[PDB]
């Protein structure tokens, strides 16, 4: 460093990579990559383009999808190459919410589903539901069904004796320990 290692192109290139890890949805990797950068530029070339991916990751950790969508939408103004990771990240906000909504509610009208999933078109909402496997019947969703299916899959796999942990199984453990 300070002898042909640090440049304007470098600041641009690392900014784009941090979005790559985040648009793949690895926050394991993203935060471990951030240390490595702590040692390098973050006050030696201050944050002016690297602030972008870090702000975004934070807003979804508190859980505010408002602040997150806005930050993406104003990066869509800038058609450069940063925008190629912005659309991935707007697809990602939809999926996360669709993971949450199972516990959150049981009924939403269709106008309400649209509102949480950041759709401006009621047709577009119905189209995502096919692909995301949401049963909207008479313009109202049923999260209790979806929850069942996913629970059923988790019961099916071999984990299952000591996942539940049988009344019998407990005492059998105790018994052989005292005699061993």
């Amino acid at each position: 460093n300070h002898k042909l290692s640090e440049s304007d192109k470098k600041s641009k290139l690392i900014s784009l990579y941090l979005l790559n890890l985040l648009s793949q949805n690895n926050t394991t990797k993203f935060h471990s990559e951030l240390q490595y950068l702590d040692k390098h530029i973050k006050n030696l070339e201050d944050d002016s383009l690297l602030s972008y991916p870090i702000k975004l990751d934070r807003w979804l950790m508190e859980g505010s999808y408002q602040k997150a969508w806005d930050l993406l939408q104003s990066g869509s103004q800038n058609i450069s190459e940063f925008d190629s990771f912005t659309d991935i990240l707007k697809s990602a906000i939809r999926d996360e919410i669709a993971k949450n909504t199972e516990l959150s509610y049981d009924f939403l009208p269709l106008s309400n589903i649209k509102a949480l999933l950041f759709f401006n078109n009621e047709k577009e909402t119905e189209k995502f539901a096919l692909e995301r496997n949401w049963p909207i019947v008479n313009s109202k969703v049923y999260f209790n069904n979806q929850s069942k299916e996913k629970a059923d899959y988790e019961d099916e796999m071999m984990h299952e004796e000591d996942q539940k942990t049988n009344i019998i199984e407990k005492a059998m453990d105790y018994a052989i320990s005292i005699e061993n």
Binding site: E33, Y36, K39, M61, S64, L108, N112
Partner: protein, 475 residues
């Protein structure tokens, strides 16, 4: 007079070496040699410091040396040369031994057992440099000299255990020089430093030395963390081999503390919490260990705010560690109350300190936990609560925003409520009486197995030192 003082220091060292030499002639062992070796190292660290800069030099000259005596002396020239007590009667001897490195025998070359001796003269030169508290070129010269000597031949089990303790000092002195005054060649030589440490671990695998393996694993974890190469360390920690059999309890303290760092970065706050408590209970209470404890406590407070667990106020007050821990004490009060305004003040007031320990990265993730902890307090306090009332309390935006915070927050289960968006309140799911559910069954099982595991460790350990004493003649 002046010869008496260097001669006395030498005679202390000789008895300690001779003890081990006898022990490894019968059959090489690991643990019995080490306990003696650790006692010698303490005496050398104290005599090098307190008694002149030429008491090491007398010894180095006194024994046969490949070229070490001249490399030792070089270091002393720079800080006002020494020449005294290197004439015959400090070089006409090889210092009481029965016949295995005795004066008459070695000079005659009926035997030569420089084997053990060379490794101990290395131990002195590392101690002596950290005593001086100096760095520059002397570090480089220490790195260059000892490493290929030890790599141009395999070591015996005893000699490998001396050379594990030299690697730590090489690494530590290189890293301090970067922190006194950063340089540009320190960076390129770090790749070199990096290469030798991992290559060492393979070398120790073949000798089957338990204590050599553990101490190198501690080094690789530390080296990744200051370089911030966490990615490579995440592969490492899921593919380790650490033994806890012969290791000292300092090594074990360090090992667990390193894990807690990497884990916290990967957004594991539950495994990190278990291991940081492990590291502290191994460590002493002493001011010897003081600085190890401060860094450990800094991380320990941080993990709890990342969970939503919120450290004790007592914990700062019962220790006299208050002023070091002053920035985490202001974070503790901030997250508990729900006050973002209090939080934002703390991270601007103390930014510089946090950024020194490289725990600032971990600290910014706490701006989220104020908001999430704030919603959990409001769901405790009111079973059902309007959206608007949250916005006033935590100084947030629209209710639509607050809805989103909770939808995400209950995916981890932090709030343990659910939102009604046609009834306009948030209704929490807790109404305890889980003793009428089947939950305690699961819990009691786990505690019973935890007890069984402590029983087993009791069995193997209780009889192994008993066995050494009963075999050993003392009748």
């Amino acid at each position: 007079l002046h010869h008496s003082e260097k001669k006395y220091a030498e005679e202390d060292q000789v008895q300690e070496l001779l003890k081990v030499l006898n022990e490894i002639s019968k059959t090489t062992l690991t643990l019995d040699p080490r306990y003696i070796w650790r006692s010698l190292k303490d005496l050398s660290s104290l005599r090098n410091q307190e008694l002149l800069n030429a008491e090491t030099l007398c010894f180095t000259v006194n024994v046969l040396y490949p070229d070490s005596s001249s490399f030792k002396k070089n270091l002393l020239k720079f800080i006002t040369s020494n020449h005294k007590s290197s004439v015959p009667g400090s070089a006409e001897l090889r210092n009481s031994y029965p016949a295995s490195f005795y004066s008459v025998n070695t000079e005659k070359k009926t035997i030569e057992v420089t084997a053990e001796i060379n490794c101990f003269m290395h131990l002195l030169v590392q101690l002596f440099l950290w005593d001086s508290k100096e760095l520059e070129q002397l570090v480089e010269f220490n790195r260059k000299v000892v490493i290929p000597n030890l790599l141009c031949y395999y070591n015996l089990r005893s000699l490998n255990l001396i050379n594990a303790k030299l690697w730590f000092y090489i690494y530590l002195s290189h890293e301090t020089l970067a922190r006194s005054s950063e340089e540009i060649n320190s960076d390129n030589q770090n790749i070199i430093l990096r290469s030798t440490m991992m290559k060492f671990l393979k070398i120790a695998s073949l000798k089957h030395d338990n204590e050599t393996k553990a101490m190198l694993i501690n080094l690789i974890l530390r080296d990744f963390l200051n370089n911030g190469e966490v990615d490579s360390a995440s592969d490492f920690i899921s593919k380790l081999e650490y033994p806890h059999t012969d290791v000292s309890s300092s090594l074990e303290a360090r090992y667990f503390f390193y894990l807690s760092k990497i884990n916290a970065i990967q957004l594991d706050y539950s495994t990190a919490n278990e291991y940081i408590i492990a590291a502290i209970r191994k460590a002493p209470h002493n001011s010897k260990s003081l600085g190890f404890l401060q860094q450990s406590n800094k991380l320990h407070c941080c993990i709890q705010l990342l969970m939503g667990d919120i450290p004790e106020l007592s914990f700062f007050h019962q220790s006299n560690m208050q002023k070091s821990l002053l920035p985490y004490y202001h974070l503790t009060k901030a997250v508990k109350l729900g006050d973002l305004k209090k939080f934002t003040s703390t991270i601007t007031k103390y930014k510089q300190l946090l950024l020194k320990d490289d725990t600032y990265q971990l600290c910014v993730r706490l701006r989220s936990n104020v908001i999430k902890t704030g919603i959990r307090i409001i769901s405790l306090t009111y079973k059902k609560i309007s959206l608007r009332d949250i916005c006033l309390k935590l100084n947030l935006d629209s209710e639509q925003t607050v809805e989103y915070m909770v939808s995400r927050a209950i995916r981890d289960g932090v709030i343990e409520a659910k939102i009604n968006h046609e009834d306009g309140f948030i209704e929490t799911t807790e109404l305890l009486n889980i003793y009428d559910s089947e939950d305690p069954q699961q819990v009691f099982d786990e505690r019973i197995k935890f007890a069984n595991q402590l029983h087993d460790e009791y069995l193997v350990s209780m009889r192994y030192p008993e066995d050494k004493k009963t075999q050993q003649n003392e009748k």
